[PDB]
Amino acid sequence: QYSPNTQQGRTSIVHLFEWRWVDIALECERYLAPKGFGGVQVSPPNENVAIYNPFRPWWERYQPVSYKLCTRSGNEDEFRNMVTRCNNVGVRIYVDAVINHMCGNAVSAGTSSTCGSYFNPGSRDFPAVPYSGWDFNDGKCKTGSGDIENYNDATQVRDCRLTGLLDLALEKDYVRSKIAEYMNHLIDIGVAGFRLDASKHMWPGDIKAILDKLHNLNSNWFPAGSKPFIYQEVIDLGGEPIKSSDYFGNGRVTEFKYGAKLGTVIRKWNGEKMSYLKNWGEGWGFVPSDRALVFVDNHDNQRGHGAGGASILTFWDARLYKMAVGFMLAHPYGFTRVMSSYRWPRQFQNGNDVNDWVGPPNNNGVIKEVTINPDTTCGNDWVCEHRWRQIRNMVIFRNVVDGQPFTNWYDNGSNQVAFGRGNRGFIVFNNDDWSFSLTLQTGLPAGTYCDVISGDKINGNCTGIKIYVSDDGKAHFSISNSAEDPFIAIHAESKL
Numbered sequence: 209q210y211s212p213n214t215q216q217g218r219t220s221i222v223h224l225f226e227w228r229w230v231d232i233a234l235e236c237e238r239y240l241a242p243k244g245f246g247g248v249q250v251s252p253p254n255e256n257v258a259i260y261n262p263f264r265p266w267w268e269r270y271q272p273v274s275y276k277l278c279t280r281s282g283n284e285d286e287f288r289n290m291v292t293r294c295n296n297v298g299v300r301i302y303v304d305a306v307i308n309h310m311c312g313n314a315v316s317a318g319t320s321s322t323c324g325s326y327f328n329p330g331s332r333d334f335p336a337v338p339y340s341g342w343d344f345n346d347g348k349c350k351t352g353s354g355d356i357e358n359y360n361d362a363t364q365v366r367d368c369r370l371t372g373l374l375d376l377a378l379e380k381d382y383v384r385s386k387i388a389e390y391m392n393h394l395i396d397i398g399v400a401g402f403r404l405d406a407s408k409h410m411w412p413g414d415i416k417a418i419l420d421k422l423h424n425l426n427s428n429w430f431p432a433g434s435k436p437f438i439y440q441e442v443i444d445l446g447g448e449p450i451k452s453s454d455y456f457g458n459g460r461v462t463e464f465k466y467g468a469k470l471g472t473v474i475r476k477w478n479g480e481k482m483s484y485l486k487n488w489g490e491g492w493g494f495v496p497s498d499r500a501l502v503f504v505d506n507h508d509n510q511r512g513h514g515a516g517g518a519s520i521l522t523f524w525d526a527r528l529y530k531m532a533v534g535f536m537l538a539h540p541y542g543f544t545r546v547m548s549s550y551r552w553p554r555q556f557q558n559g560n561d562v563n564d565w566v567g568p569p570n571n572n573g574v575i576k577e578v579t580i581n582p583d584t585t586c587g588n589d590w591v592c593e594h595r596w597r598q599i600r601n602m603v604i605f606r607n608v609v610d611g612q613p614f615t616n617w618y619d620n621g622s623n624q625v626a627f628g629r630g631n632r633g634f635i636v637f638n639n640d641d642w643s644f645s646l647t648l649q650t651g652l653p654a655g656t657y658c659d660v661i662s663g664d665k666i667n668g669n670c671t672g673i674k675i676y677v678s679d680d681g682k683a684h685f686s687i688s689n690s691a692e693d694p695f696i697a698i699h700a701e702s703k704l
């Protein structure tokens with residue numbers, strides 16, 4: 209469960225949040241494959257509640273109605289088309305699996321659902337599965353409200369309703385089997401693995417029992433006996449009784465400390481400085497590298513109400529965000545996920561964004577296509593961070609340096625730092641309030657290298673900065689503190 213099952217040489221996934229299946233399929237072919245992306249995390253592909261107050265929020269997709277592959281992203285045909293087309297160009301699909309719960313207990317009964325299936329939350333009736341009252345934790349939960357009240361009680365966190373979401377009885381073989389049926393449908397279509405949503409709210413042993421029922425990956429694309437990559441969403445910032453290590457038997461875990469701390473560091477908040485990043489990884493109290501799924505922001509915390517609070521960096525903070533993503537992609541710790549977002553009309557009132565519910569760009573609820581602009585950016589309010597040169601080129605950097613050791617660290621005791629990855633790549637940051645101008649040991653072979661942050665190698669030309677590495681491995685770097693992108697990265701495949 210620990211291996212991503214990406215094609216050899218591909219080392220990241222991108223969350224194409226709320227994208228339509230047809231747009232992901234095209235994106236695999238026209239961009240993700242040639243630019244070396246390992247795979248895509250898709251939004252939940254199973255039928256959910258169509259919530260109209262507020263108007264089609266992103267979070268409706270976290271309230272299942274059935275396991276039909278029928279959503280605002282597309283239908284089953286379109287989902288299958290996408291997985292096939294992506295696998296056929298060596299780009300994998302990872303499904304966001306919403307398996308802790310069905311929908312909110314107070315949602316009105318009817319057919320307000322993305323495939324029109326009937327459901328009745330009040331009577332616990334989801335006939336498109338089918339589930340009934342016997343399949344939920346009403347009896348097992350011990351709180352007065354039936355909802356989770358106290359995260360200091362690890363039992364109620366698992367057995368009671370997360371903000372009123374009907375909590376599936378995951379100890380039951382019937383329920384485990386219906387979930388496995390859904391997941392095996394997806395595996396056989398060709399998915400490479402799963403994000404397990406709300407894993408903190410499930411017992412590690414119930415997750416185990418579900419995973420036990422799963423097929424090996426599709427043998428047209430994956431070697432025999434391949435197992436789905438599993439990354440469990442466990443939000444563990446320390447201090448709580450539930451620890452993400454309790455989930456290591458089942459797969460990797462999301463390391464939410466990663467972006468919270470990195471954001472604080474890059475913002476230079478709480479006395480933090482980039483020079484402290486020398487021992488980044490387990491030294492900062494994180495999970496072992498081989499069990500981490502890391503990221504700067506995710507779809508929830510980029511809205512500010514999330515794990516990491518105000519320190520989280522997002523596309524709204526573009527300049528610092530690129531630096532944080534670049535550091536993450538250069539550093540060997542963890543398996544990296546890049547976010548790809550849409551814009552929405554933020555409106556703050558006492559620090560809270562009252563529009564943080566807004567769903568993807570849409571025409572009266574129909575999701576808008578991702579358009580590609582002549583400069584390779586996206587239109588229709590899709591942010592397409594994964595297309596920003598500085599991020600896409602660092603996804604490639606990570607591929608190029610795969611397996612190479614963290615080495616040749618430099619710091620100035622403040623916020624000017626640099627490091628290499630064996631003899632294959634080197635990166636330099638200036639986050640201080642004065643310029644960086646210094647000759648550093650890069651560990652790289654002599655030559656002229658294109659800086660892949662400011663530009664690209666095209667044939668035998670660079671379109672941005674050139675760095676000149678001498679016979680002894682040393683090169684000069686100049687970075688103004690006022691620089692648009694105050695970091696430089698070079699690697700074996702950017703050498704002229």
Ligand SMILES: C[C@@H]1O[C@@H](Oc2c(-c3cc(O)c(O)c(O)c3)oc3cc(O)cc(O)c3c2=O)[C@H](O[C@@H]2O[C@H](COC(=O)/C=C/c3ccc(O)c(O)c3)[C@@H](O)[C@H](O)[C@H]2O)[C@H](O)[C@H]1O
Nearest residue numbers: 267270271306370371373405406408441443508513514515
């Ligand atoms: C910070 C917390 O955020 C929200 O908790 C959620 C969280 C959550 C769960 C946690 O254990 C946790 O530590 C955390 O910070 C957030 O997980 C969800 C998973 C789902 O599949 C579906 C969901 O609806 C949630 C969810 O709601 C809850 O807030 C509710 O969010 C509602 C909107 O839904 C979300 O914000 C969904 C967030 C989400 C959705 C999917 C995720 O994987 C995820 O990590 C988070 C609002 O309408 C309500 O007004 C508000 O009460 C909770 O009360 C609040 O304390």
Ligand SMILES: [Ca+2]
Nearest residue numbers: 366367375409
């Ligand atoms: Ca639960």
Ligand SMILES: [Cl-]
Nearest residue numbers: 403441462506
């Ligand atoms: Cl996540």
